[PDB]
Amino acid sequence: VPPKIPDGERVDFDDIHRKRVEKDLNELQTLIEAHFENRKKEEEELISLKDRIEKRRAERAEQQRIRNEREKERQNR
Template sequence: MEKDLLELQTLIDAHFEQRRREENELVALMERIERRRAERNEQLRSRTEKERERQARLAEEKLRKEEEEAKKRAEDDAKKKKVLSTMPHFGGYLAKAEQKRGKRQTGREMKLRILAERKKPLDIEHLREDELRWIKKIPLIKKIPPQIKKNPILIKKILSNEIHPNKKATPPPELTPPLKNAPPPIKKSRPN
């Protein structure tokens, strides 16, 4: 019986020793899990911070590029306007005439120079679309006879026909010339 008790005692001791080892392993495993979780959180935090910095850097770079492009575009527009504004005055053979300062200008060159100085370039860059359409209509309005100018409906019809010639629109009867050899218009009688 003593032998059995000894055997039982060794089994109990072995069991408790095994249990203590397993508990130590479990504690070490839990510590490792917590450490890994903390490392992962730290990595995620640093990764999101780096990504945020990268996004901010990209946005700043994009904004800088857009500003540079806008500045370059503005400079190009200014150069174009400057060139276009000086072109009518010093274009073609007129520029050569300006370079020949020692020679006397002929009458024709003088007239052309005076006309070029009088003629200013059209400044229509800032106009809206409806204003440009109105400017386009001005020559058409000048062609309309004075009797018809009093009727705004007729003017609208004429302008729409002139601006959109492909549109099928019938001209007003006042503007259509009478047909030769045409029968007189039939008057509708009212029923009594």
């Protein structure tokens, strides 16, 4: 015989609605908030840190220019 489904009572089509209710709204909110928090945390902090890097490398590179000048005064005698 085919699989004789045993005699129960119910149910269906409430589960699909239940599954959709969470995803459509709460998942949307938490996902968009995760996007926002990730953007805010990463982009601004790292761009500020990298402009800090740019100014520090400017300082170090100018210091090395001065080192080159003094080295070519003490060397080219």
